[PDB]
């Protein structure tokens, strides 16, 4: 699995994110999943999953997304599936 497998790898990474996200809000023992989702949100400048949209508020309730609502630039954050796509492609 390498370069010519871009679409596959991204698909897996997104799935990985989903799993972490699901674990991060469902349980309170899952601290590694919380750390993983926080790191994805901070590194990729995203927040939430495009497939698990119903979880978004829970994600915010758990303080997993690092930006508040004072700055308008941070109100409209893209979900991490878009940011994963942008990462594995050259552009945005």
């Amino acid at each position, epitope marked *: 699995t390498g370069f010519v497998n871009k679409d596959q790898i991204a698909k897996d990474v997104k799935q990985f994110y989903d799993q972490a996200l699901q674990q991060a809000v469902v349980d309170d023992d899952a601290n590694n999943a919380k750390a993983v989702v926080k790191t994805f949100h901070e590194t990729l400048d995203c*927040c*939430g999953s*495009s497939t698990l*949209t*119903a979880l*978004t*508020t*829970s994600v*915010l309730k758990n*303080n997993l*997304c690092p*930006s*508040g*609502s*004072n700055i308008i630039s*941070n*109100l*409209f*954050k*893209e*979900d991490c599936h*878009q940011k994963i796509d942008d990462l594995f492609s050259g552009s945005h």
Partner: antibody
Amino acid sequence: QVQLVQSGSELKKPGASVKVSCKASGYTFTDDSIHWVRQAPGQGLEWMGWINTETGEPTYADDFKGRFVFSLDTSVSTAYLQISSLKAEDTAVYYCARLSPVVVIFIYWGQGTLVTVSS
Amino acid sequence: DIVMTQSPLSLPVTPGEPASISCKSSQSLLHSRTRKNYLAWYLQKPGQSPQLLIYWASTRESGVPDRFSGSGSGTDFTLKISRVEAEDVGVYYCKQSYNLYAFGQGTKLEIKR
């Protein structure tokens, strides 16, 4: 648990001022902005504007630009709504709400403060 | 700015029957980058502050019963209740947050007898 607790009912005469408080708890108060919504008795909700809880800069809605002042005190995690030169039409319930990002909605509200202006 | 309009402004429903509330905005609420429709549905019950029911047009908030559902995109949106129950009476507002914030007139859901 997140809570926005506002001050009690106010009874003023036409021409005076009034200061309503909105104390936040359960989250970092300076992360999210605080918005104000007016509701006249028997009328709908109207967004009045918001205040940046980190810098203190207010932003007023067009219909509420003038006699309304959004102030702040982060030491006690409290937003304030001030109305000067009160008139009869200012009698209403004033809510504060916490804006959540990403979803851009008002999940957490205050119980509202009734302000009654009558000579 | 952006103007919100709700129909109908007064909705009496027989308990157990479905209900539908339409919401139309002057401009599109779809964000080109996030692909989200920044429209929400709040319910204000008698003597209470508004509570959030639906966000992003169709995502149900945690805890809201499944009989509440949102749909639509761009400028046309709808809030549906599969089975209207007694505890649902109150004023339903739609609110846009794409550019600033604006509430609809509100739909007072009452009981039909």
